[PDB]
Structure formats: C-alpha cells, structure tokens
Design a protein around this ligand. Structure first.
Ligand code: HEM
Ligand code: HEM
Ligand code: HEM
Ligand code: HEM
Ligand SMILES: CCCCCCCCCCCCC/C=C/[C@@H](O)[C@@H](N)COP(=O)(O)O
Lengths: 141, 146, 141, 146
C-alpha cells in the first residue's frame, strides 16, 4: 500500500528518468545477471553479452510496463494483469527473483538520479517495486 | 551449521527406514502441486492439470525417484556434499537451466513428507537435523552455478 | 488468493485440530526454534527449553488466532486487524520469519493429521498460512 | 568467499575513496527509513518518526560509524571474514538479540548508497564484487548464532 507521499516520490523520481527508461532498464538487467548469476536460467535463449540486442530490447519492455504502472499507480493490479497472467502461466518465474531485479533497479536509479534518490524517495521506490512484484506473482497459485 | 555426531547418526537411522522410491515420487509430486510454477521444467511429462494427475503421473513418479536417488546417495558424503554434487550443480546450471530455489523448495516439500510418513516419530530434534541436511544439499547443488 | 476449494480444504484440516491447538502450537514453535535458531532472537524473555510454560501459552495464542482466521477466512484482513498492528508497530518481526513458522506449522500438522494431509490439502494449507503471513505484515510500512 | 584478483582490487580502490563515518551513518539511517521495522532495536535512540528525524538523529549517525567501521576493518581480511567478525557475531546473538536478516538488509542499503555516491563509477561489474562482499560479511556475523 503506497501513500500519497510514496506516489509523489515515485512519479517524481521516475518522471525524471524520462527518455532513459529503456537504457536504465537494460542496465538493471545487466547488473542483475552479473550480481545474481542464477537469474540467467530464465534467459537461456538470450545473448547476455554487454549490449546484446536482446537485453537492450528486453530492457525497454521492462521499463515500459513500469512507466505504465506509474501512470496507473492507483490501479496497478488492473494495469499489470496481462503481464501478471504472463509470468504466472508461461514464464512462471520463481518469486524470489523479483526482489533481485528490484534491488538492481534501485541501484541503477541510484547511480543516475543523485539529486532525487533521497532516503525518502528510495524508501518509496522500494515499496513501489515491491508492490509491482507482488502483482506479478499475484496469480501464481 | 554442520551436523553434530548425534545428528548424523540420527539422519542415518531414520533414512534407513525410508522408501526412497515412494518418497522421491511423493516429494517431487507434491512439489508441482504446492508450487505450480515448478512445472515449467516438465512440459513433456504430459497431464499435470490436477493434483491426482501429477501425483499419479508415471514420468513424475519416475523422476521423483531418480532425483531422490542422487539425494539418497548424498547422505553418505555429509562432509563434502559440496564435492559430491559439483558435477550435478555444474550440470543443472549449464544444460537444464534450473533456478536453485527449486532445490530449496523441494527440500521443503521433502521435510513435510518425511513428517507425513513417520508422524510422532519425526521429532522436532530430527526435523532440525534434516533441515540442515536439505539446506546443505540445496547449497552444494547451487555452488557451481555461474 | 484463496479459492472456494482452498477454503474448504482449510476448514476441514484445521477443524480436525480441536483442543490440540495449544499443543500443536507449542510444537510448531519448538520445531522452529530448533530448526531455525535465529528465530530465537525474538524471545530473549521466553524460556525456550522443552515444556516451557511460556512456549505453551504462546503456543495456544498462535493457535486460537488461526482458529479465528479460519472462521473468517473470507475476510482475514479485518479479522486480524489488531494482530497486524501488533507485529507492524511493536513486535516488528522481519517478514523473512513468517515463512519459517508456517513451514513448521505444516510439518507439525502433517505428523499429526496423516489422513487429511493430501497433496491438495497440503497445497491449500500453504497458500493459507502465507495469506495470513501477508496480512500480519501488511502494515509494516 | 570467492573474489578474483580483479574484483578484490576493485573493492579496495573504490573504498579508498570512501568516507567511512559519513557513509556508515548514511547507510544505518536509510536502513531505518526504508525498512522501518528495524528501529525495533533502537528505542533509546530517540525521535525516529520521519525520514529527516532518522537521517539526522545524532545517535543514529554515531552508531553507523562503529558499524561501518567494523565492516571497514573487515575488508582487510576478505579471506577471514569468519574469524574477523567472530566476536561481533557472538554479541549480536547473545546480548543484542539481532535477527541476522538485518545484516543482509544493511548490505543492500549500503550497496544502494555506494551506487548513489559514486554514480556511474559504481558500474555493473563493480557492484557484483561488492554484493559478494556484503554477503560474505552478513554471513560471518550470522555464523556464531545458535
Ligand atoms: C520489475 C519486474 C518485472 C517486470 C515489470 C517484468 C516485465 C516483463 C515484460 C514487459 C516482459 C515482456 C513481455 C511481453 O513482451 O509482452 C517480460 C518478459 C520476461 N520476464 Fe518479466 N518482468 C519482471 C520481472 C522478471 C524477473 C524477476 C525475471 C527473471 C529473473 C523475469 C523474466 C522474464 C522473462 C524470461 C521474460 C521473457 C523475455 C523474452 O523471452 O524475451 N521477469 N517481463
Ligand atoms: C534433491 C535435489 C535434486 C537432486 C539431487 C537432483 C538430481 C537430479 C539427477 C540425478 C538428474 C539426472 C541428471 C543426469 O541426467 O545426469 C536430474 C535431472 C533434472 N533435474 Fe534435478 N535434482 C534435484 C532437484 C531438482 C528440482 C527440484 C528440479 C526442479 C523442479 C529439478 C529438475 C531437473 C530436470 C528437469 C532434470 C532433467 C529431466 C530429464 O532429463 O528428463 N531437479 N536431477
Ligand atoms: C503464522 C504467523 C503468526 C501468527 C498467527 C502469530 C500470532 C501471534 C499472536 C496471536 C500473538 C499474541 C498477542 C497477544 O497476546 O495479544 C503473537 C505474539 C508474538 N509474536 Fe506473532 N505470530 C505469527 C508469527 C510470528 C513470527 C514469525 C514470529 C517470530 C519469528 C513472531 C513473534 C511474536 C512474539 C515475540 C510475540 C510476543 C509474545 C510475548 O511477548 O509473549 N510472530 N503472535
Ligand atoms: C555491517 C553489519 C554490522 C556491523 C559490522 C555491526 C557492528 C556493531 C558494533 C561494532 C557494535 C558495538 C559493539 C558494542 O556495543 O560493544 C554493534 C552494536 C549494535 N548493533 Fe550492530 N553491526 C552491524 C549491523 C547491525 C544492524 C543492521 C542492526 C540492526 C538492524 C544492528 C544493531 C545493533 C545494536 C542494537 C547494537 C547496540 C548499540 C548500542 O546500544 O550500543 N547492527 N554493531
Ligand atoms: C544458516 C541458516 C540461517 C537461517 C535462514 C533460514 C534457514 C532456512 C531456509 O533458508 C530454508 N530451510 C527454508 O526456508 P523456506 O522453506 O521457509 O522458504
């Protein structure tokens, strides 16, 4: 459950990311694959080399949904349902990883948003990512 | 968190009364019922649409057996599980692409089975030991990942 | 999320606990303190030795809370209103722990209700205990 | 622990640029802002009702120093984190009664603060090395629990 202050911080920090969404999306993925090897078992069909067209491509798509979750932050469960159905019936990605990607996303945003990544924003962004993940695993069983 | 002599000679004695075949199939079975998504690695096993379909599924029974087999053979290298499964970890990572969490979950289902079978015989002190075991097995199996 | 089937499997299994609540309760704990020592960092005031009077008592509370949760499975959130506030604002147990107690709760029930602990029912108890574990931590931040 | 000569070097050269007292307090505070339930161990510290109250709590900033201080002497013993934090591990268990999960949480808060302070410099390969470090320390502080 995000608060008015949470949503303010989120829309604020993410709104700043702007046109760097895709790019930052690819970085979090590159940060996650190197920091948490095990996460690569879900991308056996991917070329994971630095800057692979696959990763860059999967990076945008990720950030796009997040960009969308932000626009409907008061109705994410419905804005992410098609994506949630996906991760539950097809990809079936084990829940424990979401937290892993979420960390890497924070880390990525921390490096790029030095002015806005304040303790408050950071905290709020953690609740957002955690809130999104919970939605993506909401239909796992 | 290594096992104490008394714990090692407790794991043994209990395991000696275990029907690896049935428990391996019961464990891997329940694993695809309680945590649905783990069914992603077994698309070719056929029908899994329900609890009885998976539990009664031959290919599942069989794999449950093979799997506990390696595990069963493991309770003998309780001082170097890390060395026993190096080639299986190296394997589950490179070819099968299995997320190590599954090793943790299965172990979780295992403890519930072993409890389901022995009942009051499966003592808190014994569970603790097996937790260590299962936890240990999970780790070595993940150790060689990269 | 709990299906009409999960609820039915729950009322059935747990209803078969009767007056063995305080008993299995204490047991689920004792198991947890032996299997997972780190969980003992939240009871420096309890006697954690076998047959401890505090563990028994605590065992009973935890049990009756579940009984209550079951009797109101349709709307657990309000049923556990106070309890969530407690852990959220005072006890402050890290959410990592709830999974341990739960597991210990399953083990306990298994070794005590062999018949009704079918794969299905097992699968339903799990979702159940996690649903509870989520409500209790819902107000953490 | 498994650090290659490369990631070992990286971890030291970047920490040579680090202000230990300013970050120890930057990390302990965020840890208490992001994951609020952690204040459970600091009732005597005073006002912790808001983000600025936490970050600016003199007692919080005074403690974050001895914390990241110990963690800083630990980086000179990356091959012996176990014994390094032997005495600290025993204390956080027997006297302070601190669920080890917390060391894991501080480790990620720290990583977030490292990236935040060094920006682009804290590249993906550099993070990977640090993740290994905090994991190592957190596990060395948990080792002695019972
Ligand atoms: C921030 C959380 C996440 C979001 C927003 C998310 C979003 C997405 C999106 C939008 C896609 C593209 C689907 C499409 O094309 O319609 C996708 C694909 C995928 N996701 Fe997730 N995901 C998340 C977390 C995870 C995690 C934790 C993993 C892995 C450890 C994962 C593994 C996958 C895989 C394997 C694909 C397939 C991509 C491909 O085959 O190209 N996702 N996800
Ligand atoms: C108790 C831990 C486990 C052990 C010791 C183990 C052992 C084994 C063994 C002996 C094999 C045969 C390897 C070979 O062909 O040389 C195998 C294959 C495999 N394992 Fe594991 N395994 C374990 C847990 C799991 C879990 C929980 C999953 C995930 C649900 C899994 C998925 C697989 C798959 C899909 C294969 C190959 C299936 C096939 O070839 O038809 N394993 N495992
Ligand atoms: C299955 C989830 C859980 C349930 C149903 C539960 C239930 C309860 C109940 C009913 C109380 C009684 C409060 C009162 O007297 O009014 C309580 C107290 C407490 N709970 Fe939770 N709890 C759960 C999980 C946890 C976990 C995971 C831990 C620790 C690892 C924990 C630690 C505590 C502690 C320390 C107390 C204080 C007891 C005392 O001061 O005597 N709880 N809990
Ligand atoms: C990098 C991990 C950490 C290190 C190296 C560490 C180190 C220390 C040191 C050196 C002391 C003081 C020794 C003494 O009082 O005699 C201490 C005390 C303490 N630590 Fe930790 N600690 C770590 C993480 C944590 C975390 C994350 C928490 C809580 C969430 C925590 C809670 C405490 C508390 C309550 C004290 C007592 C403070 C007082 O009242 O004096 N520590 N720690
Ligand atoms: C060394 C252990 C320190 C304590 C961490 C909790 C230990 C156990 C878990 O990782 C797994 N046995 C099961 O957790 P789960 O099955 O509850 O997810």
């Amino acid at each position: 459950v995000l608060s008015p202050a949470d949503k303010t911080n989120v829309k604020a920090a993410w709104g700043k990311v702007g046109a760097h969404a895709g790019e930052y999306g690819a970085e979090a993925l590159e940060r996650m694959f190197l920091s948490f090897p095990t996460t690569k078992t879900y991308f056996p069909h991917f070329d994971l080399s630095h800057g692979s067209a696959q990763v860059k491509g999967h990076g945008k798509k990720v950030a796009d949904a997040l960009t969308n979750a932000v626009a409907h932050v008061d109705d994410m469960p419905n804005a992410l349902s098609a994506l949630s159905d996906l991760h539950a019936h097809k990809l079936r990605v084990d829940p424990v990883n979401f937290k892993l990607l979420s960390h890497c996303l924070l880390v990525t945003l921390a490096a790029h948003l030095p002015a806005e990544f304040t303790p408050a924003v950071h905290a709020s962004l953690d609740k957002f990512l955690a809130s999104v993940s919970t939605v993506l695993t909401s239909k796992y069983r | 968190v290594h096992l104490t002599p008394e714990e090692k000679s407790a794991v043994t004695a209990l395991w000696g009364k275990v029907n690896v075949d049935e428990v391996g199939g019961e464990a891997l079975g329940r694993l695809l019922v309680v945590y649905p998504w783990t069914q992603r690695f077994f698309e070719s096993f056929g029908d899994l649409s329900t609890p009885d379909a998976v539990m009664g599924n031959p290919k599942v029974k069989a794999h449950g057996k093979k799997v506990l087999g390696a595990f069963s053979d493991g309770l003998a290298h309780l001082d170097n599980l890390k060395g026993t499964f190096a080639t299986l970890s190296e394997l589950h990572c490179d070819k099968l692409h299995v997320d190590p969490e599954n090793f943790r979950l299965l172990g979780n289902v295992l403890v519930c089975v072993l409890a389901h079978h022995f009942g009051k015989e499966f003592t808190p002190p014994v569970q603790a030991a097996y937790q260590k075991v299962v936890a240990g097995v999970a780790n070595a199996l993940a150790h060689k990942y990269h």
